[PDB]
A paper describes a structure:
Manganese peroxidases (MnPs) are, together with lignin peroxidases and versatile peroxidases, key elements of the enzymatic machineries secreted by white-rot fungi to degrade lignin, thus providing access to cellulose and hemicellulose in plant cell walls.
Besides the amino acids of the polypeptide sequences, final models, crystallized in the presence of manganese, contain a heme prosthetic group, two structural calcium ions, and a substrate Mn2+ ion, as well as 180 (Ape-MnP1) and 171 (Cst-MnP1) solvent molecules (with three Mg2+ ions from the crystallization medium also present in the Cst-MnP1 structure). Mn2+ binding was confirmed by anomalous difference electron density maps. Mn2+ oxidation site in Cst-MnP1 also maintains the typical octahedral geometry of the other MnPs. As for Cst-MnP1, the E36A substitution in the Cst-MnP1-E36A variant resulted in the complete loss of the enzyme's ability to oxidize Mn2+, as expected given that Glu36 is one of the only two amino-acid residues (along with Asp176) that contribute to Mn2+ coordination in this enzyme. This confirms that the catalytic site of Cst-MnP1, formed by Glu36 and Asp176, fufills the minimum requirements for Cst-MnP1 to act as a MnP. Moreover, this site is stabilized by Ser40, which contributes to anchor the internal heme propionate to the alpha-helix, where Glu36 is located, as inferred from the analysis of the S40A variant.
Residue numbers in the entry: 1 to 331
The structure:
């Protein structure tokens, strides 16, 4: 099929999406950047989709409920920071004609593709409008323990392997509301790169808080300007998840493959995949990221708090002063 747009595709139903993706890239992602809006779109995709249970009715999953029922879902504590994300998305969404769910999930996949090293995520298309808001408490909190995290994910259909896979997202992530004095504080020292740096950096001994001291949801971090979530800390070190976490360190392909597979499930939670169309070809091709990660300057294996009995990966050390991580620019 040649779309009237000129683009070629497997299914005519995907033709609408080529202009939408251009709209996103220009008017949401500032010309296809791995910046605030791209990171935000991935976070929104997770918040929308996790409003789902295999067992009980905890929402329609990846239905775009978090947009259509924005007023309700933005009242929930774990959706802190989401208002800024949806506020910025709405002007773009409004000119697309898409269901809220197809828009949220497309934007999350396109945004991810803007980050060097990221997978080109599967994009299934065809999410009917949402019927109801998710209830409260579907989204994990950074103060949650591993029991609670693993329980919530399992309820939605994800095992421990998949939880670690999905936390790869924190390689391109910053916090705006855990400490409102330091918006845009990243979780790793390569917030514009979809690499395995966050898996290493969370394993370093934490030494300081990045902003206005101790705030609920964070723990001591190893670098000035870097935030460490309490949830990432406990998942990295718990016996159920530690080997999974360590395996990601300096293993770019394991991270990307694991993440790609888990995201393909996440982004269709609640949906009837047999009634959807494969429109994966509308997602931009991401820039590659091969070479290895390295320790931040001044650190070494002495500073790693190794939580798994497997031999730790060999990672190059860098001579120099400990680095300061810059905040992410607001837009
Ligand atoms: C235990 C599970 C999780 C917890 C407790 C958690 C918690 C957090 C917190 C507290 C923030 C900072 C929010 C703010 O202050 O603005 C954040 C950011 C983010 N999270 Fe997670 N998260 C989890 C899982 C995930 C998953 C599964 C994804 C996607 C697959 C995701 C993607 C992101 C992204 C992309 C950001 C960055 C947003 C930005 O830079 O604007 N998270 N997360
Ligand atoms: Ca939802
Ligand atoms: Ca990174
Ligand atoms: Mg383990
Ligand atoms: Mg290992
Ligand atoms: Mg911007
Ligand atoms: Mn943000």
């Amino acid at each position: 099929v040649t779309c009237p747009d000129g683009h070629v595709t497997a299914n005519r139903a995907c033709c609408a999406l080529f202009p939408v993706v251009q709209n996103l890239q220009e008017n949401l992602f500032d010309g296809g950047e791995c910046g605030e809006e791209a990171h935000s779109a991935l976070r929104l995709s997770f918040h929308d989709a996790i409003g789902f249970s295999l067992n009980s009715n905890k929402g329609g999953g990846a239905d775009g409920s978090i947009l259509l029922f924005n007023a309700t879902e933005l009242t929930f504590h774990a959706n802190g920071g989401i208002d800024d994300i949806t506020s910025r998305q709405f002007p773009v969404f409004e000119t697309t004609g898409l269901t809220p769910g197809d828009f949220v999930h497309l934007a999350g996949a396109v945004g991810t593709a803007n980050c060097p090293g990221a997978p080109r995520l599967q994009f299934m298309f065809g999410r009917p409008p949402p019927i109801a808001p998710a209830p409260d408490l579907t989204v994990p909190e950074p103060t949650d323990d591993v029991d609670a995290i693993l329980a919530r994910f399992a309820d939605a259909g994800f095992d421990a392997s998949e939880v670690v896979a999905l936390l790869s997202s924190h390689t391109i992530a910053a916090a705006d509301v855990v400490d409102v004095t330091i918006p845009g504080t990243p979780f790793d020292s390569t917030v514009g790169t979809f690499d395995t740096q966050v898996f290493l950096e969370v394993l370093l001994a934490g030494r300081s808080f990045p902003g206005n001291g101790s705030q609920p949801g964070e723990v001591l971090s190893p670098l000035a300007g870097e935030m460490r979530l309490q949830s990432d800390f406990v998942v990295s070190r718990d016996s159920r998840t530690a080997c999974l976490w360590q395996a990601m360190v300096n293993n770019q392909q394991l991270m990307v493959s694991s993440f790609a597979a888990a995201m393909a499930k996440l982004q269709v939670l609640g949906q009837n995949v047999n009634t959807m169309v494969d429109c994966s070809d509308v997602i931009p091709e991401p820039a590659p990221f091969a070479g290895p990660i390295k320790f931040p300057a001044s650190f070494s294996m002495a500073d790693v708090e190794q939580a798994c009995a497997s031999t730790f990966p060999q990672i190059q050390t860098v001579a120099g002063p400990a680095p300061t991580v810059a905040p992410v620019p607001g837009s």
